[PDB]
Structure formats: structure tokens, C-alpha cells
Design a protein around this ligand. Structure first.
Ligand SMILES: *[C@H](CC(=O)N1C(=O)C=C(OC)[C@@H]1C)[C@H](C)NC(=O)[C@H](CC(C)C)NC(=O)[C@H](CC(C)C)OC(=O)[C@H]([C@@H](C)CC)N(C)C
Ligand code: NA
Length: 254
């Protein structure tokens, strides 16, 4: 297939409203779970021709997956996608929207940036319990609200393979190494220039483009709409910048 110079999942599949939704992980190291349920929401809609148009629950995955790591203390991508295949994930929106089976329990906050929400600060919430119970107003039992995948896989560490995967099957989850200068990002095309490592982050790659001859990936962060470019960022593409091309994981419903 010929890869276009730019691609935006939001423009290819506009009926799938999850694709253009920015979430907030709040005071919790649940990035791994957010990138997962976001991309799973997108792909469930894309791959079902819009029939499964849902917002999957970050808290169900965060609180119930035993193999995915340490909940709000951080986690692992492969097992999150395996959990979606084997057990599935229920629906649930943000705390503020309070929709679906298990909405997120934690409020929006600013992640080392200025804006209209309280600062997140340095303390993290305890991982929520695995409650297995839909909110009172939601009239589907927890087990009957589960959305499952058929397959999960790592994507090859190859730029064209990642582009082909996104444009055929939808947004992917990806890990990268966060350095201190990432916390200063306001806009533009990120690359690591200063600062020491702060560990790994997990995000959702929705497309790609080029500006002034500089190729980039277009990425949804999970730090609310005040962060970066209305919740998104761009990062250098093609050079495995911060390992962005080396920890890509996704999956399919069929
Ligand atoms: C979400 C990302 C995040 O919350 N943050 C940042 O990226 C920068 C921040 O503040 C400055 C905040 C805290 C979480 C924390 N990141 C992760 O879960 C990564 C995800 C991968 C990139 C896929 N993984 C980890 O942090 C990982 C999880 C364990 C294996 C369960 O843990 C670590 O790397 C270490 C350590 C256990 C490694 C052996 N540790 C828990 C931070
Ligand atoms: Na901003």
C-alpha cells in the first residue's frame, strides 16, 4: 500500500467519537491502561463499522488486571491487550461525565503545565479495588457489559509497518522513554534535548505528518486537553526517538 505524507485517524473514521476524545489519568500512573482502553475503544468502533461505539473503562482494566503490573504504580502493555482478549473490558467515561458501567473515580488535574484544573502534584492515589459492579443507573450487569478482542500483538519496529497498521486497523498503543524536558512541552515537534530519564510513558498514536520537512507522529496524551496541543503532541518520526517505534502494541476484534 502507498503511505500518504499525512494521516489522521480522526479524519478517516469521524463516526468513531472515541478517536478525538482526550482523557485524563489523574494522580495515578495508569498511562498503560489509558493508552490501551483508548485504542481498544477506537478499534472496536473502526473494526465493527461503527456498531461498537463505546468508551471502555480505564478503571476496570487498571483495577482488575493482575498480570498488567502495579495499578496506579505503573504497568505493562502486552498483558493489557491480552486481558482485553481473554476477559474483556466494560464501558465507563471520565469522572465528570459519569457514564457507562464503571466511570473513572479520579478528577482532572494539570500534569506539570498551566491551566484551569487543580495541579496534579506529586502524590498518587491508591489503586482502586476491582469492584465488578456497574453504577446504579446503568442497567446492564458488569459481566454482560464486557467488550473483548480476538487477537493482540506487538507491531514490528519499522516506520512503514506502524503506518500501515494504523491506517488499516486504527490507532495503536505505544511506549516511550520520558525525559525531564518532555514535562516542559507546550507545542511543536518533540525530541529529547535535555534532562534525565523519568521512566516510561504509554500513549496512543493516531497518525503522522510532516512540517517544514520534519516528519512526526501525531499522538494523544492522557493528561487532559490543557496539556500540549489540545491534549495531543507531535514527536520526531523515523529515528526511534525515545524508543517511540519499539514498544507498539495493538489488537483486533476479528
Ligand atoms: C504512566 C506514565 C506516568 O504516569 N508518568 C510519566 O510518564 C511521567 C510522570 O511524572 C513525571 C508520570 C508518573 C506510568 C507510570 N508508566 C508506566 O506504567 C510504564 C509503561 C510502559 C512505558 C509500557 N511502565 C512502568 O513504569 C513499569 C511498570 C512495572 C513493570 C509494573 O515500571 C517501571 O518502569 C518501574 C520499575 C518497576 C521497572 C522494573 N517503576 C514502577 C516506575
Ligand atoms: Na496546551
Amino acid at each position: 500500500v502507498e503511505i500518504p505524507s499525512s494521516f489522521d485517524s480522526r479524519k478517516k473514521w469521524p463516526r468513531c467519537k472515541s478517536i478525538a476524545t482526550i482523557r485524563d489519568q489523574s494522580r495515578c500512573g495508569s498511562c498503560w491502561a489509558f493508552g490501551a482502553v483508548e485504542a481498544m475503544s477506537d478499534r472496536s468502533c473502526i473494526q465493527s463499522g461503527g456498531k461498537q461505539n463505546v468508551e471502555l473503562s480505564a478503571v476496570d482494566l487498571l483495577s482488575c488486571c493482575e498480570s498488567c503490573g502495579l495499578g496506579c504504580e505503573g504497568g505493562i502493555l502486552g498483558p493489557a491487550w491480552d486481558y482485553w482478549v481473554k476477559e474483556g473490558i466494560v464501558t465507563g467515561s471520565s469522572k465528570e461525565n459519569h457514564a457507562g458501567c464503571e466511570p473513572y473515580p479520579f478528577p482532572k488535574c494539570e500534569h506539570h503545565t498551566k491551566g484551569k484544573y487543580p495541579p496534579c502534584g506529586s502524590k498518587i492515589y491508591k489503586t482502586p479495588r476491582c469492584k465488578q459492579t456497574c453504577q446504579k443507573k446503568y442497567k446492564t450487569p458488569y459481566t454482560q457489559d464486557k467488550h473483548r478482542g480476538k487477537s493482540s500483538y506487538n507491531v514490528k519496529n519499522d516506520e512503514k509497518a506502524i503506518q500501515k497498521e494504523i491506517m488499516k486497523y486504527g490507532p495503536v498503543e505505544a511506549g516511550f522513554t520520558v525525559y525531564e524536558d518532555f514535562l516542559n512541552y507546550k507545542s511543536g515537534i518533540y525530541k529529547h534535548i535535555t534532562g534525565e530519564t523519568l521512566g516510561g510513558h504509554a500513549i496512543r498514536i493516531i497518525g503522522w505528518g510532516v512540517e517544514n520537512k520534519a516528519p512526526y507522529w501525531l499522538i494523544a496524551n492522557s493528561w487532559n486537553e490543557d496539556w500540549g496541543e489540545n491534549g495531543y503532541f507531535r514527536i520526531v518520526r523515523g529515528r526511534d526517538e525515545c524508543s517511540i517505534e519499539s514498544e507498539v502494541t495493538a489488537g483486533r476484534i476479528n
